[PDB]
C-alpha cells in the first residue's frame, strides 16, 4: 500500500498497541495486589498468632494445602512487575519493548505447576473447612480485615486467580503481537514471548494431567491397610477394573475386593471405604482358567461354583476360585484380564 493508506493503518496499530501495553501493566498491578492480599490477610495473620488459628480449627497442614506455594508465586511476580514497570517507564508508550521480559521470566513461571496441580485438593478442602463454624468465621474475618466486602467474590475466587492469570498472558501477547508490526523493534521478541507463555501453560496443563494419574494410585493405596511389596506408583500406571467377588481357596467362601492394574492384581478384605491387604499377583505370572457352572473341586472346597473362574499364581503355584454375582460381571472380569495381558505383551514389542 501507498504511504497514505499505510500511515492510516500505522496510527491505528500504535494506538491499539498502547491500549494493550496499558492493560498488561494495569492487570499485572491488580494481580500482584491480589497476591499481596492473600499473603497479608491470611498467611501473615496466621503466622503472627499460630495458636489462635489452630485453636479455631485451622491446622498447619490445612494452611499448606489451602494456600500451596502462593508466596513463591508472589515473589516471582514482584520481580516480573518491576521488570515490566522498568520497560514502561515513566508511562507506557507505543515504542516500548516487553517481549524480552517474558522470555527472561519463562523459566521462573514453573512455580505454577505445583500450585495448579494442588488447587483441586485446596478447593475441596475449603468446602469442608467452611462446614466448621469457627473456621468459617475465621476465614470471613480474614476476608473482611483484608478489605473484602460481604458481597465480594468468595475466597475460592481469589485462590483460583493464579490459574486464571497465567492463561491470560497468551491472550494479551496474542493481541500485542497483532499490534507489533515487523518494523517494530519489539516484533521478534513478542512473537517469541507468545510461544514461550503458551508453552508455560501447556507445561502446567500436562503436569496436572501427570500428577492426577499418580495421585489416583496413591490415594487408592492409602485406603489399604497392611500393604506389602512395592508401591502401586512404582510398577503400575492405572486401575483397570475394581469390584467385589467371592473368593475360595480350599476353605471358607470369603468376600474380597479385587483391583486389576496394568501389571498387578490386588485383593483385599473390606473393613466394616477402607481395606485390609490380603494379596497381590504380578500379572506376568498370573494365569486364568474358566470354571463351568455347577462344578466343584478341591480349590472350591466342594462348593458349587457359578459365574466363576480360577486364578493361578505360577510363581507360587497357588490357585483360588473367584465367583461373580452375574454372568455379565464374570465376562467383564475375564475380558479385562485378557485385555491387560494383550496390552502388556504389545508394549513388549
Amino acid at each position: 500500500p501507498g504511504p497514505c493508506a499505510a500511515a492510516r493503518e500505522s496510527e491505528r496499530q500504535l494506538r491499539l498497541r498502547l491500549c494493550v501495553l496499558n492493560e498488561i501493566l494495569g492487570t499485572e498491578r491488580d494481580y500482584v495486589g491480589t497476591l499481596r492480599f492473600l499473603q497479608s490477610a491470611f498467611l501473615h495473620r496466621i503466622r503472627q498468632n499460630v495458636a489462635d488459628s489452630v485453636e479455631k480449627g485451622l491446622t498447619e497442614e490445612n494452611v499448606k494445602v489451602l494456600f500451596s506455594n502462593i508466596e513463591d508465586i508472589l515473589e516471582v511476580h514482584k520481580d516480573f512487575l518491576a521488570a515490566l514497570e522498568y520497560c514502561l517507564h515513566p508511562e507506557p508508550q507505543s515504542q516500548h519493548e516487553l517481549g524480552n521480559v517474558f522470555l527472561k521470566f519463562k523459566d521462573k513461571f514453573c512455580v505454577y505447576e505445583e500450585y495448579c496441580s494442588n488447587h483441586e485438593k485446596a478447593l475441596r478442602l475449603l468446602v469442608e473447612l467452611n462446614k466448621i463454624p469457627t473456621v468459617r468465621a475465621f476465614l470471613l474475618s480474614c476476608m473482611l480485615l483484608g478489605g473484602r466486602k460481604t458481597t465480594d467474590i468468595p475466597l475460592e475466587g481469589y485462590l483460583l486467580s493464579p490459574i486464571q492469570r497465567i492463561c491470560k498472558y497468551p491472550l494479551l501477547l496474542k493481541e500485542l503481537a497483532k499490534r507489533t508490526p515487523g518494523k517494530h523493534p519489539d516484533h521478534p521478541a513478542v512473537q517469541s514471548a507468545l510461544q514461550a507463555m503458551k508453552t508455560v501453560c501447556s507445561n502446567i496443563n500436562e503436569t496436572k494431567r501427570q500428577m492426577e494419574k499418580l495421585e489416583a494410585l496413591e490415594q487408592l493405596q492409602s485406603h489399604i491397610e497392611g500393604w506389602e511389596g512395592s508401591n502401586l506408583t512404582d510398577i503400575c500406571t492405572q486401575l483397570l477394573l475394581q469390584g467385589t467377588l467371592l473368593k475360595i481357596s480350599a476353605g471358607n467362601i470369603q468376600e474380597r475386593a479385587f483391583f486389576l492394574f496394568d501389571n498387578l492384581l490386588v485383593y483385599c478384605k473390606r473393613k466394616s471405604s477402607l481395606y485390609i491387604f490380603r494379596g497381590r499377583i504380578n500379572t506376568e505370572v498370573m494365569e486364568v482358567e474358566n470354571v463351568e457352572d455347577g462344578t466343584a473341586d478341591y480349590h472350591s472346597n466342594g462348593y458349587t461354583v457359578t459365574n466363576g473362574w480360577k486364578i493361578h499364581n505360577t510363581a507360587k503355584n497357588k490357585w483360588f476360585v473367584c465367583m461373580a454375582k452375574t454372568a455379565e460381571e464374570k465376562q467383564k472380569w475375564l475380558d479385562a484380564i485378557i485385555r491387560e495381558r494383550e496390552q502388556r505383551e504389545s508394549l513388549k514389542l
Binding site: 491500549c19 483441586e120 468446602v127 486464571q164 497468551p170 501453560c201
Partner: protein
C-alpha cells in the same frame, strides 16, 4: 442473601469476555474492549428479591483441558456460549463444552447462549461465511441444540447492542 456462582464457557471466538464486560460496565464499548475480566460480584434485582450474582470468565483456558475444571465445582448455573456467526463454535457446544460441563456438574442448570446476534444480518459477515460455504446459526437451529443438551433456556444476545443481554443473566438467576 443468596449467592449465585455463574460460569461462562465456550470457544475463544464467541466473545465471553465482551459479553461480561458489556453487562457489568457503563458506556460499553468505549475506546477499547479489554482482554481481561476479573471475577465479578454484584447485587442484581430479579422478580423482587435481590441476589448476589458472581460472574466467572474462562477466557484463555480453551486449549488447557486439565485447567478448565478447576472453575467448575460449586457452580450454580452455566452459560454455554457459541457465536451465531461461527458454525464451528456451535458444533463445539455438542462436541466439547456440554460433555465436559455435565461430566463435572451432572445436575447444574445450563443456559445455551447465542452471541453476536448483531452480526447475523451483517452483510460483510454473511459474505465472508459464504466464501467458506457457511451460514449463520438460525434461531430454530439454536432451539434444537438447546433441546439436545437439555438446556433450561435458549437465549440470543449481542454484547455490542446489548439486545437480549440483560435477559441472559436474569434467566441465569431464575434457573437457580
Amino acid at each position: 442473601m443468596q449467592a449465585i456462582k455463574c460460569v461462562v464457557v465456550g470457544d475463544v471466538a464467541v466473545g465471553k469476555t465482551c459479553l461480561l464486560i458489556s453487562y457489568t460496565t457503563n458506556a460499553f464499548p468505549g475506546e477499547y474492549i479489554p482482554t481481561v475480566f476479573d471475577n465479578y460480584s454484584a447485587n442484581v434485582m430479579v422478580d423482587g428479591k435481590p441476589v448476589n450474582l458472581g460472574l466467572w470468565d474462562t477466557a484463555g483456558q480453551e486449549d488447557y483441558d486439565r485447567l478448565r475444571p478447576l472453575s467448575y465445582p460449586q457452580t450454580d448455573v452455566f452459560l454455554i456460549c457459541f457465536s451465531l456467526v461461527s458454525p464451528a463454535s456451535f458444533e463445539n457446544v455438542r462436541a466439547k463444552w456440554y460433555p465436559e460441563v455435565r461430566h463435572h456438574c451432572p445436575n447444574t442448570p445450563i443456559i445455551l447462549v447465542g452471541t453476536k446476534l448483531d452480526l447475523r444480518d451483517d452483510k460483510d459477515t454473511i459474505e465472508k461465511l459464504k466464501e467458506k460455504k457457511l451460514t449463520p446459526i438460525t434461531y430454530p437451529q439454536g432451539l434444537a441444540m438447546a433441546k439436545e443438551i437439555g438446556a433450561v433456556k435458549y437465549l440470543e444476545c449481542s454484547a455490542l447492542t446489548q439486545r437480549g443481554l440483560k435477559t441472559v443473566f436474569d434467566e441465569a438467576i431464575r434457573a437457580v
